[PDB]
Amino acid sequence: DFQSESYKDAYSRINAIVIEGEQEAFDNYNRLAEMLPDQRDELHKLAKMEQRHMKGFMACGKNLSVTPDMGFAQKFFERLHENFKAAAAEGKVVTCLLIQSLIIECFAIAAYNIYIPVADAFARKITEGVVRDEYLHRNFGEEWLKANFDASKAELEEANRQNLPLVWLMLNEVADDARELGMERESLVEDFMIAYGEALENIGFTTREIMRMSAYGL
Amino acid sequence: MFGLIGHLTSLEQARDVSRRMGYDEYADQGLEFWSSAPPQIVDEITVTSATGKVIHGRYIESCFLPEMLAARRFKTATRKVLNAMSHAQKHGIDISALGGFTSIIFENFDLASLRQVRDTTLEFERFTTGNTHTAYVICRQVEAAAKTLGIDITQATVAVVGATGDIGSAVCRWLDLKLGVGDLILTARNQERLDNLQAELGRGKILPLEAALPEADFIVWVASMPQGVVIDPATLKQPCVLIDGGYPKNLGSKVQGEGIYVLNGGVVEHCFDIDWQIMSAAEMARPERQMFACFAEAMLLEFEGWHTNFSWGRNQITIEKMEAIGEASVRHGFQPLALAI
Ligand SMILES: *C(=O)CCCCCCCCCCCCCCCCC
Ligand SMILES: CCCCCCCCCCCCCCCCO
Ligand SMILES: [Fe+2]
Ligand SMILES: [Fe+2]
C-alpha cells in the first residue's frame, strides 16, 4: 500500500514486463496480419489498439516516477517470442494465434484483474480501460479457431503443450515481485486458468480436454 | 436448467474422486493446486418427476475443500464460492443449489457485498441454499425414525446440535409446532443466538454439547463443523438415534453400539433412477436414487418453476415454506431416507 521504497523496485520490472508485453502484442498482431490476408484489416486494428495500451502503461510508470527495466522484460518474454518467431517463420498460424490471442491475452486479463484492486488510483483507472479490450482480442483468436476447429485442434493441443509451461515459469520468476505490488501468485494462477479455460470452451474443447490442457506443466 | 454447486469432503476424497473420473490432473496435486483451480461443470443431469415432467441440470465443482478453513485460507474459500456462482450464471443456469459449506461461507463472510465477480454481477435470485428442504426432510426423518423404533416423539428428548443455524433453527420450530416433541435441547456456540432462539421458541433448555448428549433420545447434528467430532457410544442413552445432517458429517467416526442408530440426515430418495455420477462420488447407499436434500430443492424449484432464492440467508425459514417445499417433494416423487434395518 505504501507506493514507497521496494514498491518502486518491484514496479520497475513489472511495468517493464507490461510495456514489453504490449510491444510483443503489437508485433505479433502485425505479423498475423501478413499471415492471414483475408482479415489483414481487422488484425491491423487490434494491433494498433495494442500500441495505445503500451502508451497507457508508459504513463503509469511515468507519474509514479518509475524507470522500467526494458532489459529484464525482454529476457522475460524471450522463450515465447522465440516460440512465436519460429512458428510464424514456419507459417503455422494456429500456433501463433494460441500464443498471442489465447495465452498472452489471458495472461494480461489475469494480471490486470489482480492488479486493479491494489493499484494506485491513476494506474487503476487506466488499467480498467485496457482489460476490456483484452477480452475482445481474446475473442478474435476464439472465433477464428472456432471456425477452423476441426482443422486446428491437434496443433492447438501441441502449441498448448509447448507454450503453456512457459506461463508457469514466468509466473514463478515474477512471483515475489508481484507480491510487493500486493498481488498473490495463487490468485494469478486462478484468473489465468479461468480466462484460458473459457476461451478453450468457446473454441470447441470439452471439459476434460480443457482440464487436461489448462493444467499442463503445473 | 437447474444447477448443483458442491465440493468434496476432503483432499483425499477429492484426489480419489478425480482419479476415479478421468481428472488425473487434479488427482495428482495438493491443497495449493485446489486453491487456484477454476470451477468446472463435471456432470449433466436429467430427472423425471412422478408427474412426468423432465428437467435438466448441471453439477458444478467449486473445488472448495474444508481444510482451507483450518489452514485459514479464508480468502481462497471465498473465491471458490464466488467463482462457482459466477460460473453458473455465465452458463445460463436458472436456479442453483449452494451445497454444503458454500452456503455457509456465503453467509459467514458476507459474500452479498462482493457480488461483482470479474465481469459478472451475481443475481441472488438464481441461487438457493436448499436449507428449507433439508430442514423439512430432517424433521420427517425424526418423525419416521421414532415411529420405526416404537418411540413416542411427544414423550422424548431431541437435542439439536447447531440449533442457531439456518437449518437447526427451522428444525426446532417444526419439532415444536408440528411434532410436539417432549423436550428440546438447544446446543450451539453463540450464547446470545441461543438465548434469542429460546425466547422465540418459548421453550427448550440450553446445554453444552457434553451435557446434551447423555440426555437425548434423538440428536440432530446440523453444526457447521469443517472436521467432525468423535463421539463415544458409552456417553449416549440406549436406544439413541443420531441424525447426522452435516456436510462434512458432524460425526467424525463410526458411532456403533447397542441401542445406537445412525441415519444420514437430509437425504432423500427418488422413485426413478437418475443418470449421473456425482452421488457415487458422494457415497450414497443407492447413488442412482439418493441425493442430498439441498440439491433436491433446486430440482423441486425447477420442477415447479419457482425460479427464486427460495432458501436464502440465515434464520428466515418458516413452517409454511417447509410445508410448501415438502408437499412439492412428495408430489414429484421424493421420500426421506429411512433407517436401514
Ligand atoms: C446439501 O444439502 C449438501 C450438499 C453437499 C455437497 C454434495 C457434493 C457432492 C459431491 C459431488 C461429486 C464431485 C465430483 C466432481 C469432482 C471433480 C474434481 C475435478
Ligand atoms: C501488472 C502486474 C501483474 C503481474 C504479472 C506480470 C506482469 C503482467 C504479465 C505480462 C502481461 C503482458 C500483457 C501484454 C498485452 C497482452 O495483450
Ligand atoms: Fe493489450
Ligand atoms: Fe492484447
Author numbering:
A (entry chain B): 11 to 228
B (entry chain A): 1 to 341
Question: Which of the paper's sentences describe this entry?
Answer:
The earlier discovery of the pathway responsible for alkane biosynthesis in cyanobacteria allowed the conversion from solar energy to alkanes through photosynthesis, without providing external carbon sources. This two-step pathway utilizes two water-soluble enzymes, namely acyl-acyl carrier protein (acyl-ACP) reductase (AAR) and aldehyde-deformylating oxygenase (ADO). AAR catalyzes the first step of this pathway, reducing the substrate fatty acyl-ACP/fatty acyl-coenzyme A (acyl-CoA) into the corresponding aldehyde in a NADPH-dependent manner. Subsequently, ADO catalyzes the conversion of fatty aldehyde into alk(a/e)ne with one carbon shorter (Cn-1 hydrocarbon) and the formate as a C1-derived form. Here we report the crystal structure of AAR from Synechococcus elongatus PCC 7942 (SeAAR) in its apo form (AARapo), together with three structures of AAR in complex with ADO from the same species of cyanobacteria (SeADO), in which AAR binds either substrate or substrate/cofactor.
In our AARthioester–ADO structure solved at 2.18 Å resolution, we observed a long tube-shaped electron density, which can be well fitted with a stearic chain, within an interior tunnel of AAR. No electron density corresponding to the CoA moiety was observed, despite the incubation of stearoyl-CoA with AAR prior to crystallization. This finding indicates that the acyl-enzyme intermediate was spontaneously formed, and the CoA moiety had already been released. The structure showed that the C1 atom of the stearoyl chain (stearoyl-C1) had formed a covalent thioester bond with the hydrosulfide group of C294 (C294-SH). Mass spectrometric analysis of the stearoyl-CoA-incubated AAR sample that was used for crystallization confirmed the thioester bond formation, thus the AARthioester–ADO structure represents the acyl-enzyme intermediate state of AAR. One end of the acyl-tunnel connects with the wide cleft above C294, forming an L-shaped, long channel. At the other end, the acyl-tunnel can be seen to extend toward the AAR–ADO interface with its opening surrounded by residues Y23 and Y26 from the NTD of AAR and sealed by M221 of ADO. In the AARapo structure, this acyl-tunnel is broken by the side chains of M279 and M21. While helix 7 of ADO interacts with the NTD of AAR, the acidic residues of this helix form strong electrostatic interactions with the basic residues from the long helical region (R73–H91), as well as R118 from Fr-II of AAR.
